[PDB]
Amino acid sequence: SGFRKMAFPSGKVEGCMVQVTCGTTTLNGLWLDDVVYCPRHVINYEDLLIRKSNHNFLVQAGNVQLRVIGHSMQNCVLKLKVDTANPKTPKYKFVRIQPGQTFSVLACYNGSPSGVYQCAMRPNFTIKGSFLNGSCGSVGFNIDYDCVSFCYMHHMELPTGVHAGTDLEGNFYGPFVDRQTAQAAGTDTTITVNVLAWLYAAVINGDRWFLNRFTTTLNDFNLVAMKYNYEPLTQDHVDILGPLSAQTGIAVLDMCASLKELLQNGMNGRTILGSALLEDEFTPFDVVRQCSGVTF
Amino acid sequence: SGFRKMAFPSGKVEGCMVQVTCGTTTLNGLWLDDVVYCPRHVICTSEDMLNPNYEDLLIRKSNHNFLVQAGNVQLRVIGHSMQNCVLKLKVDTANPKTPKYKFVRIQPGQTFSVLACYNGSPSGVYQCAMRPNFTIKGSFLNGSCGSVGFNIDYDCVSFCYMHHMELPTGVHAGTDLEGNFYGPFVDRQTAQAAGTDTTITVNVLAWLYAAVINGDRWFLNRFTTTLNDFNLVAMKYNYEPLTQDHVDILGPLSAQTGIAVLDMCASLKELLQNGMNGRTILGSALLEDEFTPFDVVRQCSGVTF
Ligand SMILES: CS(=O)(=O)Oc1ccc2cncc(NC(=O)Cc3cccc(Cl)c3)c2c1
Ligand SMILES: CS(=O)(=O)Oc1ccc2cncc(NC(=O)Cc3cccc(Cl)c3)c2c1
Ligand SMILES: [Cl-]
Secondary structure: OOOOOOEOOOHHHHOOEEEEEEOOEEEEEEEEOOEEEEEHHHOOHHHHHHOOOHHHEEEEEOOEEEOEEEEEEEOOEEEEEEOOOOOOOOEEEEOOOOOOOEEEEEEEEOOEEEEEEEEEOOOOOOEOOOOOOOOOOOEEEEEEOOEEEEEEEEEEEOOOOOEEEEOOOOOEOOOOOOOOOOOOOOOOOEOHHHHHHHHHHHHHOOOOOOOOOOOOOHHHHHHHHHHHOEOOOOHHHHHHOHHHHHHHOOOHHHHHHHHHHHHHHOOOOOOEOOEOOOOOOOOHHHHHHHOOOOOO | OOOOOOEOOOHHHHOOEEEEEEOOEEEEEEEEOOEEEEEHHHHOOOOOOOOOOHHHHHHOOOHHHEEEEEOOEEEOEEEEEEEOOEEEEEEOOOOOOOOEEEEOOOOOOOEEEEEEEEOOEEEEEEEEEOOOOOOEOOOOOOOOOOOEEEEEEOOEEEEEEEEEEEOOOOOEEEEOOOOOEOOOOOOOOOOOOOOOOOEOHHHHHHHHHHHHHOOOOOOOOOOOOOHHHHHHHHHHOOEOOOOHHHHHHOHHHHHHHOOOHHHHHHHHHHHHHHOOOOOOEOOEOOOOOOOOHHHHHHHOOOOOO
């Protein structure tokens, strides 16, 4: 029993965190094999990069200084070739996630990991993270089997306190650029398939007060959900929730009618899994994993 | 900016998790130097759990009855002893991944990270608090016994909790790493129930100071309170009494934000009376009590927005 916002064990990622200094700027880098990946804003980026030499980049792994022997840029990520392969390099992949998907963030300062938390890529491509100055270069990841899938690298904070960054190939999530200009997150929406998954997790943990005898149609549900700034629910989402529907005995459009009643009438002083708000940062896969005990 | 429930990086603890098997029971152990620590109920059958005599069950065991597995390697058990509710298995190999560590016993209201494991394999990490009724609201399934709670301030891992059991309400009970239970619990399948739980007042106040640091002040009022009047009101909402120690501990946050502890107590009093009126505080519609004053100072900036 119990339902917590759970992050993946961070050890495989901790053994990759390094400190990258260029002039006055210090941020975090990801050391995989003989390459250190970090935000290019550590340095017209091609014009600024051409003026740099290998010895201008100081890379520190624990108490050891790594020697930079080459450098290149890929989109908004700087790739620093180092003379030493990381002996702690785990099995890994660079993957680009979609909005609604969740991941763990290992927040670092000066190449030293300080905390791990779980979060979701919002529909407006920002993340509601917890980052201070020096956090740049902190990474997002998932673990599937013994393989670390790196999906996010932190680049900046927006004026609303939310965060923006790139995949590990340097492509930003969202219409953001890595510069000091007028940038604002778009109007955000609630991740409907995730709220439904979280409602199924509450039923599994013995919370059924919100269940009712009613069912709905996908069309009627989407007409109602569009009124509350909820993301549209697709047939793919309905298919993905299939296993949880079979385990609890509540059809996806049956649970949608519960969500419709919760949206139109509120919680009436009640909570669901210790929350007075509808939680949208657990995917259907996160719910099945936390209510099954998958290990790494 | 931002405020998340943050856990410590778990790598230093992952390199200590092992699987302990005794007969049909399999659970987690903590391998530090040449000793594996695990719940003593690993020696029990389900029948034995009603009235187990651990001393009688342990005397019938030999070293080779305990199977310890670290990754794909079998460790050889060369000795065994019981200390309170923890079994200490002496092994022939010191853990090369043993971090700098300490065993610390925490008090209610204190927070810690939990590395939830099954079959000696870590599956997840989350942050939680020791409730005033000595239980923890964790997320654990069967096979999670032996998972540990810890804090990592600087380079030293402070082990404070080892998971032993789930109570009827879904909450969890366990021991410090010396085998002493937190709360009036026994490692026995007996009519045991968690006491009525209360809200950790000093933690809610710390979290209200964190909201002010992140630029939110809608909940403040022009009022103050005496400590006695605050406690008379707080007790009616099942909030823990606020002591002078708690007021002293909140001193730094009071100096940083410019809001006296007893003035923050007055906003808390008003929030309990009015609710949030459709508003949130740090993305929450409930008053959060699982961040200590120390957690707030660690996570938040030193400059108030
Ligand atoms: C603004 S500050 O308080 O001085 O420092 C912070 C604070 C929290 C912060 C949290 N995450 C990231 C930060 N850094 C930036 O956004 C730097 C920046 C600027 C322009 C363009 C880019 Cl790509 C990056 C943060 C800075
Ligand atoms: C056997 S079950 O209740 O269906 O599965 C669970 C579920 C969640 C669980 C979460 N933590 C621990 C579990 N196991 C026990 O409590 C074992 C036990 C029993 C009596 C006394 C003691 Cl000291 C220990 C859990 C079992
Ligand atoms: Cl303590």
